[PDB]
Amino acid sequence: TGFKDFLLKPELSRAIIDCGFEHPSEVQQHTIPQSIHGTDVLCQAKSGLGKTAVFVLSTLQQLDPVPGEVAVVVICNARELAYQIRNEYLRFSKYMPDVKTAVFYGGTPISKDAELLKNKDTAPHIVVATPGRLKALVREKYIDLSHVKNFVIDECDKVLEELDMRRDVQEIFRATPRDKQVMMFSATLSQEIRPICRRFLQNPLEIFVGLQQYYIKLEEREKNRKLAQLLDDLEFNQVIIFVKSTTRANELTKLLNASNFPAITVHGHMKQEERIARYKAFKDFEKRICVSTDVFGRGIDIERINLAINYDLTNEADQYLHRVGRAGRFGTKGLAISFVSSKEDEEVLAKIQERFDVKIAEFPEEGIDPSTYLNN
Amino acid sequence: KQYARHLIYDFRDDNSVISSRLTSFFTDQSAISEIILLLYTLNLKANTQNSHYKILSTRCDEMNTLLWSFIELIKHCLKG
Amino acid sequence: EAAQAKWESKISSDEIIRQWQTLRFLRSRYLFDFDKVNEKTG
Amino acid sequence: KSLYDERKNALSGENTGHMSNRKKHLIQNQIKDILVTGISHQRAFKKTSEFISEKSNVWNKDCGEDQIKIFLQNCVVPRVLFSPSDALFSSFFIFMAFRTENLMSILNTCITSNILKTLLFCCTSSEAGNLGLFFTDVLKKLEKMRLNGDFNDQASRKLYEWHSVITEQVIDLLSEKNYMSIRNGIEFMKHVTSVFPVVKAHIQLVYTTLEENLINEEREDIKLPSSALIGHLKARLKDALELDEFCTLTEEEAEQKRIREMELEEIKNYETACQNEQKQVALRKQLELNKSQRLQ
């Protein structure tokens, strides 16, 4: 347990074993145990490398439970990410019956949320919001910000830049005591915004920053028949199919749903509310097959995918490293299969083996061994 | 005491039927006095093996809280 | 007593992890001396 | 009795409304079930209290120094290194069975005998963590009977003398070899850091030693609790800490106080005005000097 080595409260260190984390990131290594002492922090790090894990564990040790007073304030960028902060604040506090956490965002009636905060059975110690909504609550005497001791600003460069999103974050800072701790984290911190951002902080701490691959040498029309051969030969956990268009991507799942392979579709040219829910069910193990365009090439971490097939091969070596960086996460074995069907395709792999020093060997006619990607 | 196990997530009053069936397979072969003597002996025998330095500070601790965990299953099932 | 018979023989005439396993055996009865009687505690 | 009543305050304060009859049926069944348990636990405590009181009179008729050494190692120490709920027993028994004069003589040979750097070497991560739960409940009972209860000045000199040998034992442990001495001393200092602040000086002794092992070598990722213990050690530096109100026996330490008063009065006008320039050595540099004087 690497997170009991943060020397935390015994109540907080219980659910971390139930949360599965064991190894701290380099961003979490440098700024959390100094934020416990009570000084302000200034952080720059890459996206999705444990930036949100900094401010959840830091604020649950500091809070003293008081009935009916707020103690943690988080201001964010949009309505979607504030629902993600709520789901992680309750997960580390599943074993604390006194604390509570609610979410505020636009589109919801404020007076109906005023009945949520006035009733003590849903009056939390932790309130997270977008400042587009959290400005609207204090101007009618709904909430009081005089008992808060921790302030969190995530994505501090993207919120403070716009002048309309600058006015709402200033009035909450004037409605709270300045004898307080302010936390500020973002992903991209340039040299222009950092003289702007230092107005809220007092003495801050600064932070600035195998896989078996194979390709099939075939002609043009054999690869809609090679699809149903590579599926019924390989023993797969979850498969992703990468199509470089949106016209072929919707003809395939109507072909696959009638071939008794249930599948879904997520890409562009569709509603963003549908893009969240359809990607959620794929993580929920509702179906094992999904097709997608080049939106899902970079950054998505789903560890249950070990078979990634390239229906339409890339022209570069800088997009191909991202699509097969999804399969075989953290030492797991995976597979990368590419359909070579054009003249510019063979030149792509010829620059890959000389750049990445990886030998994309030829597909054997007898098939691969079943014990080289499961046992080995 | 029943509330202190509800907060630490220690479900004993819920699956009391299923836990008694599991010790029924241990008491049919008269294995209960054999397990306690075997976990204690192997833990004490692991004080001479030379494999690593940080490993046997965790292996000795993990086998110690296994023997504590089996004794506590005996007293809940064989009651009387 | 054989561990002290192992001890009294060598005074008449890794190992620090072999010292780690002896000191988990000698903390049963001969605990309150523990200054320099078996080794240098270092 | 207080933890029995607040359980009733949970059910009465949370559930105020109409939801069902069966739910309010089961709660009022339980509000009498705790009170029959509490008075029987009181009667169980009443059965033991006059039993231990009538026993302790013929127990505390003979005090020994070698007769208490075998008790401390064959009856006390293996029930501290066993379990966290069991290590709370070994502190609650000494402060209840033995008398007031017997209590100090037991804790005499436990601390001034340098074995605490030797036990924490040969333990696990959990056995070393249970040893710290012993000295947490010992020093919490000593700090409460010094604040609320009154002592003579000769006894209060002995109480603050125990704190001097506790802090110099753990520092010698942290300056040892690779992993077993260092990792156990962190977890041992995790639980005893609650009732640490007896003297302002002793906090600064144990703080800077974590910096000496921080700069030179980093074998594994043990910088993470080292920065975490530092964030807990300095959090109690500013409450109330001065060794000159309670410890009054100052035959030479008053003189080294009187010299240090004239160095700060000279340097406060040296930072205000500038008439005759004179430089002195700062605090932490001379606070680094007396470490190696005692480390050798």
From Swiss-Prot, chain A:
Known EC number: 3.6.4.13
An annotated Gene Ontology molecular function: RNA helicase activity
Phosphothreonine modifications at: T108
Enzyme class, first EC level, given as a word: hydrolase
Helicase C-terminal domain sequence ranges: 210-371
Domain Helicase ATP-binding: residue ranges: 32-207
Statement: the UniProt record of this protein carries the keyword Phosphoprotein: yes
Primary location recorded for the protein, binned into one broad class: nucleus
Biological process (GO), any one: subtelomeric heterochromatin formation
Protein localization: Nucleus
Taxonomy, superkingdom: Eukaryota
Motif (Q motif): 1-29
Catalytic activity of the protein: ATP + H2O = ADP + phosphate + H(+)
Keyword field: Acetylation, ATP-binding, Helicase, Hydrolase, mRNA processing, mRNA splicing, mRNA transport, Nucleotide-binding, Nucleus, Phosphoprotein, RNA-binding, Spliceosome, Transport
Role according to the record: ATP-binding RNA helicase component of the TREX complex involved in transcription elongation and required for the export of mRNA out of the nucleus. SUB2 also plays a role in pre-mRNA splicing and spliceosome assembly. May be involved in rDNA and telomeric silencing, and maintenance of genome integrity. Associates with THO1, which facilitates RNA binding of SUB2 and likely plays a role in mRNA export.
Other facts: Present with 51700 molecules/cell in log phase SD medium.
Family designation: Belongs to the DEAD box helicase family. DECD subfamily.
Protein name per Swiss-Prot or TrEMBL: ATP-dependent RNA helicase SUB2
Species, as recorded: Saccharomyces cerevisiae (strain ATCC 204508 / S288c)
Organism classification: Eukaryota, Fungi, Dikarya, Ascomycota, Saccharomycotina
Gene, per the UniProt record: SUB2
Swiss-Prot record, chain B:
Domain of life the protein comes from: Eukaryota
Subcellular location: Nucleus
Function recorded in the entry: Component the THO subcomplex of the TREX complex, which operates in coupling transcription elongation to mRNA export. The THO complex is recruited to transcribed genes and moves along the gene with the elongating polymerase during transcription. THO is important for stabilizing nascent RNA in the RNA polymerase II elongation complex by preventing formation of DNA:RNA hybrids behind the elongating polymerase.
Family: Belongs to the THOC2 family.
UniProt miscellaneous comment: Present with 521 molecules/cell in log phase SD medium.
Oligomer and partners: Component of the THO complex, which is composed of HPR1, MFT1, THO2 and THP2. Together with SUB2, TEX1 and YRA1, THO forms the transcription/export (TREX) complex. THO associates with DNA and RNA in vitro.
Name listed for the protein in its UniProt record: THO complex subunit 2
Protein species of origin: Saccharomyces cerevisiae (strain ATCC 204508 / S288c)
From Swiss-Prot, chain C:
Coiled coil: none
Residues annotated as transmembrane: none
Location within or outside the cell: Nucleus
Subunit structure: Component of the THO complex, which is composed of HPR1, MFT1, THO2 and THP2. Together with SUB2, TEX1 and YRA1, THO forms the transcription/export (TREX) complex. THO associates with DNA and RNA in vitro.
Function: Component the THO subcomplex of the TREX complex, which operates in coupling transcription elongation to mRNA export. The THO complex is recruited to transcribed genes and moves along the gene with the elongating polymerase during transcription. THO is important for stabilizing nascent RNA in the RNA polymerase II elongation complex by preventing formation of DNA:RNA hybrids behind the elongating polymerase.
Note: HPR1 is not required for sporulation, and is not essential for DNA repair. It is probably not a DNA topoisomerase. Present with 1340 molecules/cell in log phase SD medium.
Protein name: THO complex subunit HPR1
Organism: Saccharomyces cerevisiae (strain ATCC 204508 / S288c)
Portion of the parent chain present: 553 to 602 of 752
UniProtKB/Swiss-Prot annotation, chain D:
Transmembrane annotation, as ranges: none
Subcellular location(s) per record: Nucleus
Extra information: Present with 521 molecules/cell in log phase SD medium.
Sequence similarity: Belongs to the THOC2 family.
Record's subunit section: Component of the THO complex, which is composed of HPR1, MFT1, THO2 and THP2. Together with SUB2, TEX1 and YRA1, THO forms the transcription/export (TREX) complex. THO associates with DNA and RNA in vitro.
Protein role: Component the THO subcomplex of the TREX complex, which operates in coupling transcription elongation to mRNA export. The THO complex is recruited to transcribed genes and moves along the gene with the elongating polymerase during transcription. THO is important for stabilizing nascent RNA in the RNA polymerase II elongation complex by preventing formation of DNA:RNA hybrids behind the elongating polymerase.
Protein name: THO complex subunit 2
Organism whose genome encodes this protein: Saccharomyces cerevisiae (strain ATCC 204508 / S288c)
Full-length numbering of the shown residues: 960 to 1255 of 1597
